[PDB]
Design a protein around this nucleic acid. Structure first.
Ligand SMILES: Nc1ncnc2c1ncn2[C@@H]1O[C@H](COP(=O)(O)NC(=O)[C@@H](N)Cc2ccc(O)cc2)[C@@H](O)[C@H]1O
Ligand SMILES: Nc1ncnc2c1ncn2[C@@H]1O[C@H](COP(=O)(O)NC(=O)[C@@H](N)Cc2ccc(O)cc2)[C@@H](O)[C@H]1O
Ligand SMILES: [Mg+2]
Ligand SMILES: [Mg+2]
Lengths: 339, 339
RNA sequence: CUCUCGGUAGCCAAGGGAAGGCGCAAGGUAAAUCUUGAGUCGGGCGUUCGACUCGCCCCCGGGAGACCA
RNA sequence: CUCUCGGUAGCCAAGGGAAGGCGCAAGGUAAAUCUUGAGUCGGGCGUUCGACUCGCCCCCGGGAGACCA
């Protein structure tokens, strides 16, 4: 149903650009929306990745044609974050990490498409379109567009300017109506909207998830050891009463709640905190806002919040950790992709 | 003979970078030198092009494997100087112009190879190497390298930065020992020398011809009408005695002399000037330096120099003009490439 | 290619017998004030009793220059 | 996408009844001094007696902004 589908597609997002495009596809064209989410097989994925994964689940639930682009070439072009022979293994590592997360939160992944960027990004039609776009995008616009995505270094490389053009062309070459990513992709997303019509290609809608802030070593690896989860959580900034600058609270806000909501309805939020009897007994918060207000009113202390978040993160990571220990290909990709 | 060959290859050049490479090819490897000259099918070629053409003749005479690269894609990437469908016709126009010049100065062109840049520049191996080089060349270096070749505009396009990288890779993909161009190519040439070894490819030698200065509408089209040649020559700067800033003198220096030398030996320079009896009779200068000294000593006036240069340019252009009027494909390429 | 400035703890660095500043970890959660502790000279070959320092060759990075403008 | 500044002779531009500056062409070769001549408002729809000027919609370019920094 085109209204229900639209509701599922846009829920929990910070920003939707060109919703009319999605609405036209669902209501006028009367077909399933084609979208993709792209990731550069760069460093090891962290707990921040849970946010896009919940959205992928919403998309599949809505009947969308969902593709994950393993942007291997992009990983090379971003300041050589992934080099030459290592990127292929990283692409696999990413593929299996993504599949483990989604399976860990009970999402059926049969209809999820995986495309490796180099499988079309080295064809003549694509190269020609790089040239065409490079003729339309200023040096200053390509630099600005990639500013919050491409690593900014003292002596910037030409690769950094090609990166955002290629991300825009991918929309066309993947044949989608829509691209999904974090709000940190906005500048590239807007570049795509402004420039693809100049090439003869249609404008695409854009879906953006909120970013889960750092904790400050300020992210948690998706295969982090329980004791390392303990340490990273402990060192996180946490002022009594401060809810505005609270990485742990925001983690619960943007990761725990949506994963729990993936049971169903905005009516399942149960956060257990194993509080020591000395400072009151254990407590289970039944809504996020209640948990938020508990902290602001200084009823929930920072150390108590740390206990609850570490236990919940450890809960989430367990099945991903277990899939890693059971899968040798996953283990091989880890070893060869990160020497 | 490796010494004679080297003499022919380097004669009349302003600068030779890495002569040891050429010497190694001719003396140690004991084979013919492989080189290329590249041109972007951009505006209509002018009388400046005579200089590279005399060098091509020297190269073929030396036994070199000579390729002219019709850099169609480059013509597009230089501020869209040649667009989309027009460039193909311009490439042909350039091919036939080049062949007419060389035939007009009695150079056998059978062994001259022509390659269209797009015939390999859109292959996956090339695209991959663009990415590799873009990872090694800074944004600042790509900008500087193309500064005197790529048109500098108020709002520079990304295409301008890709241009010089592609010119460097062409050396490898054309499988040459050496690239020939004007001294205005030096910055790109040096970029190629500094960066190709990083990719695993060998350093190439570089041959650079001097530039024939402007006359100041300050260049003469290779199909310029006699009366238009008259006008452009007349308006050229020419101070009595000034040989240091004298576009016409420099034209004789770098175009007339080498074309005449293509009879043979540095011992044929005959410049006829149809001087009106009022200011002395006609005069034929037997060496350039004598003609130069005549002007410095104020024995040869600016208007007299204008007469001689216009007649000589008209002499050179005649057979090219005649080939254009006899060749319909050449005529078609002109009409469709320059609407 | 030519000139020029650089390379010293993860980062910013001062300098013929290894300063600081940032970061790191310690010291009902963390941070921030504070006071303490851990953490070697791009490479080679020389000259010297002894080289981070002096001589040479090399490797890497920045800036500029490189017909004309 | 949001905000903001622009679009007027080839180029730089000042501005409810088309300034300059550069360039161009003229005025024993040319240039340079000099003095003279040629050369209409991004588009549409309105409001008005009359629009370059006022109102709206559009098209094009620059700069910035766009979670956080
Ligand atoms: N902490 C976080 N919270 C929420 N989301 C996070 C967090 N970290 C990364 N993400 C989100 O997960 C996605 C993958 O991150 P990434 O860094 O691997 N990907 C990129 O930077 C993309 N530029 C890769 C890409 C390449 C080509 C394309 O056509 C499309 C995309 C990004 O869209 C990002 O917004
Ligand atoms: N007035 C002149 N005097 C002497 N030579 C002149 C003159 N004008 C152009 N030339 C010389 O003729 C050659 C062709 O000029 P062009 O402007 O068409 N070519 C370029 O700018 C080259 N960048 C085109 C190229 C592209 C890819 C390559 O792999 C190699 C080359 C250039 O090497 C130039 O030095
Ligand atoms: Mg990544
Ligand atoms: Mg050209």
């Amino acid at each position: 149903d085109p209204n229900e589908a639209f509701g599922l597609i846009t829920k929990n997002l910070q920003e939707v650009l060109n919703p009319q495009i999605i609405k036209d596809v669902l209501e006028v064209q009367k077909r399933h929306l084609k979208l993709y989410w792209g990731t550069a097989p760069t460093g090891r994925p962290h707990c921040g990745y849970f946010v896009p994964m919940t959205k992928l689940a919403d998309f599949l639930k809505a009947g969308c044609e969902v593709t994950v682009l393993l942007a291997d070439l992009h990983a090379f072009l971003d300041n050589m974050k992934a080099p030459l022979e290592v990127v292929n293994y990283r692409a696999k590592y990413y593929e299996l990490t993504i599949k483990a997360i989604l399976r860990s939160i009970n999402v059926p992944i049969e209809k999820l498409k995986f495309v490796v960027g180099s499988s079309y990004q080295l064809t003549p039609d694509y190269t020609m379109d790089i040239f065409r776009l490079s003729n339309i995008v200023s040096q200053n616009d390509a630099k600005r567009a990639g500013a919050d995505v491409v690593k900014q270094v003292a002596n910037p490389l030409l690769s950094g300017l090609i990166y955002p053009l290629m991300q825009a062309l991918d929309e066309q070459f993947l044949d989608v109506d829509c691209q999904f990513g974090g709000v940190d992709q906005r500048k590239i997303f807007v570049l795509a909207e402004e420039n693809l019509p100049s090439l003869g290609y249609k404008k695409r809608a854009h879906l953006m998830n909120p970013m889960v802030p750092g904790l400050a070593n300020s992210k948690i690896d998706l295969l982090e050891e329980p004791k390392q989860v303990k340490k990273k959580i402990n060192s996180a900034f946490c002022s009594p009463g401060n809810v505005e600058e609270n990485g742990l609270l925001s983690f619960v806000q943007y990761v725990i709640a949506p994963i729990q909501e993936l049971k169903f309805g905005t009516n399942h939020f149960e956060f257990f905190i194993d509080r020591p009897e000395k400072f009151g007994g254990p407590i289970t918060y039944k809504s996020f806002e209640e948990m938020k207000l508990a902290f602001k009113e200084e009823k929930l202390s920072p150390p108590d919040l740390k206990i609850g978040v570490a236990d919940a993160i450890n809960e989430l990571l367990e099945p991903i950790r277990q899939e890693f220990a059971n899968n040798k290909e996953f283990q091989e990709a880890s070893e060869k992709g990160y020497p």
